[PDB]
Design a protein around this ligand. Structure first.
Ligand SMILES: [Mg+2]
Ligand SMILES: [Mg+2]
Ligand SMILES: [Mg+2]
Ligand SMILES: [Mg+2]
Ligand SMILES: [Mg+2]
Ligand SMILES: [Mg+2]
Ligand SMILES: [Mg+2]
Ligand SMILES: [Mg+2]
Ligand SMILES: [Mg+2]
Ligand SMILES: [Mg+2]
Ligand SMILES: [Mg+2]
Ligand SMILES: [Mg+2]
Ligand SMILES: [Mg+2]
Ligand SMILES: [Mg+2]
Ligand SMILES: [Mg+2]
Ligand SMILES: [Mg+2]
Ligand SMILES: [Mg+2]
Ligand SMILES: [Zn+2]
Ligand SMILES: [Zn+2]
Lengths: 78, 66, 184, 50, 126, 136
RNA sequence: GUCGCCUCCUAAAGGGUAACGGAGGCGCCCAAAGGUUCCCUCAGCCUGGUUGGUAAUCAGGUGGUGAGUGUAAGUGCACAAGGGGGCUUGACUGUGAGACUGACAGGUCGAGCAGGGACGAAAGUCGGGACUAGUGAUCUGACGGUGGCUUGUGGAUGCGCC
RNA sequence: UUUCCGGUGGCCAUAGUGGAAGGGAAACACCCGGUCCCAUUCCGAACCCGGUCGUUAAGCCUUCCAACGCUGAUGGUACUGCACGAGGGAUCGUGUGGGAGAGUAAGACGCUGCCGGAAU
């Protein structure tokens, strides 16, 4: 007969948004795993080596736009 | 400018061999310039060639028959 | 020395007066002028040896008076025996008084002593007042020696002028003084 | 074989502080680097071991 | 008026300086702790503003257009140095302590450098 | 035979057979049309048979348009073989037809001969179809 | 035929999801293709020009991303993460608040701090590479350092730790 | 206070692209030089410095144009959560909630904050 010349898939990477808008986070909490900057780091958000976006401070996550970039901010909690 | 990068360029006397001399400056070495012809000495735009063309078919007809 | 080149003074007085009277611009700083001279040399036959490039550098430095921009190959082409990064051309940009004196020396000395010289074409305009022409030889420039040339080479001389249209650029170059014929 | 592992040791205390890789054709000779020696407590010159 | 795109039909120097300014602003941002010191350098004057970019409002500013600096005899670099001294004095008056310097698309050289060094002499922590 | 010059993927999932026609529900080329009232897969051989029927009836007058192209490859399992061992190779080329899709257009021919030619062509298609016109 | 890893689709707009389902890649490479600082904009098209032609090199206009990205694909990047110049070794040592992701072994991101450095005028950035593959637990043994232990004591020897 | 204008942000085309006309008081800008700090993988073109002469020609700014591009309802339709129903079958329909894309009418020749200059 014949055989299948496909069959290989990589393991699941479980990317995506981990903390959504208005969610209270600690400093250092990961907000989104991503490849590239689909989201950019905003105010109080840092970007990791693998483009992970993490909270630089305590507060609430918000998603927005800064200039032309789609950003994630962590607004300090009042 | 920089030192030790460019060739020597000093004052120079020239001759155009057509009653023309100038006080330009050129890259030559320990001597003078002797050029064949200049622009004002040239026969192009002073009108001394008048080549046009030679297309007298009827002119040659009349010269060699009449 | 401290003396404005004769071409520059003649340009200013005669040519500015002529363009003001003949084209009649409504603003004083609209009269076109010579922006720069560009001497290019495609040295494409230098992928196999580098001494011909020493010759090219010497020839065009003596012609222009400044060291050239040696340009490396942009992209590799196999139809061309051409790789990437090998320098395959050299050009000199003359601006300021140097452009004027190079233009004067070219006009008075270089192009008139071409074999069976017949002027230069006036149909070589790019469409914005800038006029380019090519020389198949480099031996007309009498400021260089004769019995020590390595190999035959040519160049492209480009006049970039601040002339909006082709007609006033042609007028500018003609009034500066160019051998212009009436043939194609 | 073509990109081997090379050990960088301090030129002061001969301490095999670092290990990295090179090409052995692009860098045929031993590599000098300015690394930090935990023993010498400062930045010293490190050389590939021979 | 700050559109993210560089407006076309701008002159070549204007386009280049706009690109340089936008690239400089990528890492420079003025907060209350460290406001941004922007020096706008034209062919005649230097206009300095210290800005809290969070609120988008200028805290203090100085220029060669002020009354006590039109008559002052000096060079362009000397006038820029006097402007740097004045802006440092005004920053100390308003309680700024430290600023982050923004060359606004120009090279840190000459008039801008003299302004920055004078502001540093005045007591600015940068 | 209508076969594409090339396709990006030769092994594709079956086209969806759900929903009314997404586009091409109105005459755009000819004066009369065949409109599909049922969905299905229209192979290139059926398209060719219908085209031959119309073209042979109408003879020399007018033009015929095929609004649907069979650019969907359908694979075939190796014959007499068990299941598995990969997907088969393409065997048929189909167009995915939905109710209300104008399949063929006809022009330059009066209404009765057009009606007869399109009746002949419709008797070749695997789905139900009807003759349509531009409101006369 | 396949067996581990990476990318996309199937996968039903969080994540996950199978088949001998559909496509491809990896078992590296780079002392710069790493760090930092500064500068630059492309491909394509049109026109003019010696060799030179569609396409080497030059000039003017137009062109916003269709070029490029070490390497598959996807997500990104023109603010460039793409092109170039200068100086460099952070391709660090001791750490790791807090998190993401797996039954677990494990995989991944990480603020702030000290030491000693690189670049910058500074702000600052740097614990390799735009990101995600380029990898192998434990046992056993080996080499360098250190000197904690050593069967009566001192050595030796052996072991331990990194 | 107001008007006009020079910088510096925010929204990131309702803002742009294109066309027509007009303006420069301070400012801006081209512009004039290159001696000096500094520079071009050649060039004072650019970067940098000294001036502010000349000029509003271009940048910039004001106004007009819906032209290209951009924004864009209401209603309907597709689709769909839940509950059902029909057909021999691909598949289809209804109740109850949600509800596009396209298209149409239409909007639109930017909105706005701070600093400064001139006049008021
Ligand atoms: Mg990184
Ligand atoms: Mg990494
Ligand atoms: Mg349609
Ligand atoms: Mg999903
Ligand atoms: Mg789902
Ligand atoms: Mg399962
Ligand atoms: Mg390493
Ligand atoms: Mg922790
Ligand atoms: Mg992984
Ligand atoms: Mg430190
Ligand atoms: Mg890089
Ligand atoms: Mg065992
Ligand atoms: Mg014992
Ligand atoms: Mg350790
Ligand atoms: Mg709409
Ligand atoms: Mg609606
Ligand atoms: Mg709608
Ligand atoms: Zn002569
Ligand atoms: Zn050491």
């Amino acid at each position: 007969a014949s055989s299948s010349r496909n069959g290989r898939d990589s393991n699941a990477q479980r990317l995506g948004v981990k903390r959504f808008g208005g969610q209270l986070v600690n400093a250092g909490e990961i907000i989104v795993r991503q490849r590239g900057t689909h989201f950019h780091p905003g105010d109080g958000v840092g970007r990791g080596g693998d483009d992970t976006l993490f909270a630089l401070r305590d507060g609430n996550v918000e998603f927005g736009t800064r200039r032309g970039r789609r950003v994630v901010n962590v607004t300090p909690v009042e | 400018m920089k030192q030790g990068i460019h060739p020597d360029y000093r004052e120079t006397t020239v001759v155009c061999t057509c009653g023309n001399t100038f006080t330009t400056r050129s890259t030559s070495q320990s001597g003078t310039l002797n050029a064949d012809v200049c622009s004002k000495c040239h026969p192009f735009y002073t009108g001394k060639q008048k080549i046009l063309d030679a297309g007298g078919r009827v002119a040659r007809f009349e010269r060699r028959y009449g | 020395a401290h003396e404005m080149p004769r071409l520059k003074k003649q340009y200013r007085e005669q040519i500015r007066a002529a363009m003001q009277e003949e084209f009649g611009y409504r603003n004083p700083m609209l009269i076109p002028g010579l922006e720069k001279i560009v001497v290019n040399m495609g040295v494409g036959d230098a992928a196999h040896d580098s001494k011909v490039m020493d010759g090219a550098i010497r020839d065009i430095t003596a012609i222009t008076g400044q060291k050239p921009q040696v340009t490396k190959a942009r992209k590799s082409i196999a139809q061309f025996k051409l790789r990437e990064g090998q320098p395959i051309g050299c050009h000199v940009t003359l601006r300021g008084d140097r452009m004027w004196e190079f233009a004067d020396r070219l006009l008075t000395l270089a192009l008139p002593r071409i074999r069976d010289f017949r002027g230069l074409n006036s149909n070589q305009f790019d469409g914005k007042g800038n006029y380019t022409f090519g020389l198949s030889e480099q031996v007309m420039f009498l400021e260089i020696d004769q019995d020590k040339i390595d190999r035959i080479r040519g160049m492209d001389i480009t006049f970039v002028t601040t002339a909006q249209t082709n007609e006033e650029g042609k007028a500018l170059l003609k009034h500066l003084g160019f051998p212009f014929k009436a043939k194609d | 074989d073509v990109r081997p592992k090379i050990t960088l040791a301090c030129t002061e205390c001969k301490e095999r502080n670092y290990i990295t890789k090179k090409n052995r054709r692009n860098n045929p000779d031993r590599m000098e680097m300015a690394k930090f020696c935990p023993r010498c407590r400062k930045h010293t010159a490190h050389r590939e071991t021979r | 008026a700050s559109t993210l795109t560089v407006r076309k039909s701008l002159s070549d120097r204007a386009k280049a300086r706009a690109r340089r300014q936008a690239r400089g602003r990528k890492k420079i941002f003025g907060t209350v702790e460290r406001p941004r010191m922007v020096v706008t350098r034209s062919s005649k004057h230097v206009f300095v503003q210290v800005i809290d970019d969070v609120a988008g409002n200028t805290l203090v500013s100085a220029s060669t257009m002020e009354a006590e600096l039109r008559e002052m005899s000096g060079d362009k670099t000397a006038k820029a140095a006097r402007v740097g001294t004045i802006i440092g004095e005004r920053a100390k008056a308003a309680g700024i302590t430290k600023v982050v310097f923004d060359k606004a698309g120009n090279q840190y050289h000459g008039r801008i450098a003299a302004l920055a060094d004078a502001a540093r002499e005045a007591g600015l922590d940068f | 035979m209508l076969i594409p010059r090339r396709v990006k993927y030769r092994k594709q999932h079956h086209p969806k057979r759900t929903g009314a026609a997404k586009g091409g529900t109105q005459l755009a080329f000819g004066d009369y049309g065949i409109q599909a009232t049922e969905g299905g897969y229209l192979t290139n051989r059926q398209i060719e048979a219908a085209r031959i029927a119309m073209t042979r009836y109408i003879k020399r007058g007018g033009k015929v348009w095929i609004n649907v192209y069979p650019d969907r490859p359908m694979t075939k399992h190796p014959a007499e073989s068990r299941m598995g061992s990969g997907k088969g190779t393409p065997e048929w080329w189909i167009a995915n037809i939905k109710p209300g899709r104008v399949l063929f257009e006809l022009s330059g021919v009066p209404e009765d001969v057009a009606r007869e030619a399109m009746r002949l062509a419709i008797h070749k298609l695997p789905m139900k179809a009807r003759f349509i016109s531009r409101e006369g």
